[PDB]
Amino acid sequence: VHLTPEEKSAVTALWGKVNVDEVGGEALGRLLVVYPWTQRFFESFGDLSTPDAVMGNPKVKAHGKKVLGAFSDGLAHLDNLKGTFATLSELHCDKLHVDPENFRLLGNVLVCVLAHHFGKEFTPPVQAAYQKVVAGVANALAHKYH
Template sequence: MSILLTHPCPSPTPGGGPLPLTNSLILLGEGRTLGQEMRNKRPHSEEAAQTCFWPIRITSKLPDTMVHFTTEEKAAVASLWAKVNVEVVGGESLARLLIVYPWTQRFFDSFGNLYSESAIMGNPKVKAHGRKVLNSFGNAIEHMDDLKGTFADLSELHCDKLHVDPENFRLLGNMILIVLATHFSKEFTPQMQAAWQKLTNAVANALTHKYH
């Protein structure tokens, strides 16, 4: 469900007053709570400063505690991971993210043609980066008891240098689940889904650890 609201846009220049009211899109995901207050975000580019069209998602942040995985959950995740074609699943997951949530394309300007669904699905840079992203999940599976330590450097990179909205990590995790369910319909039981959902949520939370 999408709700269009208006709010003051932060000033693009230091010391300046707020710009006139402008529209911001707030996406309410199914099953999300409305407890988290919207945060003001300063645009990361001149174009963004002029339009100030920001995707802000109201969501509940995962508790800042260590996530414990049972032996059964670890075994379930590892058993499916052993069958995953990282290039295919990673590429499809990132492509779905760019198609379903098109505002995420602004982080991939160097990827070239992202103007249509077919262009995104066939884009070699999308496939390559998707493989790289999913490989990081392989690293997570090997370090499920220390995800925050494992992703500390990536969290700092995405926060301080790339300025990625942390909600995008959760969105990508959802895309990975959908693609896994598509490729492994029989193996992707509710129990398997629960284990992978727990992992993707924990990875997303670990990636937000360095955010202020």
């Protein structure tokens, strides 16, 4: 992503108050709960029956960790997202075959959750910047199902 620098800063500074141990679960959990067909990928995690099930799923928890952790890396290399989600894309497009649209989804639910934590602080202009970040990452794990 482009991002102006006032954008460059808002994404960041905000991203700096994120308990990653925490958001990456919310996000990976909400997804499983909101867009249910996504579950087939994580049959292995176990009981995803209810939201509370999903939410209380430590596996769900530990994984969202992994995801956001990738986000921060990506978030760090806006300039060249492709380098970063290198192996990432291979995995999703290739070994797993996950429709890119989903990636798109994981992103929006990760905006939705930032809005939840930071309330007013998450501003329209702020959302705007993140929205840019999200598209980038998406496209970056995508352009491997070409």
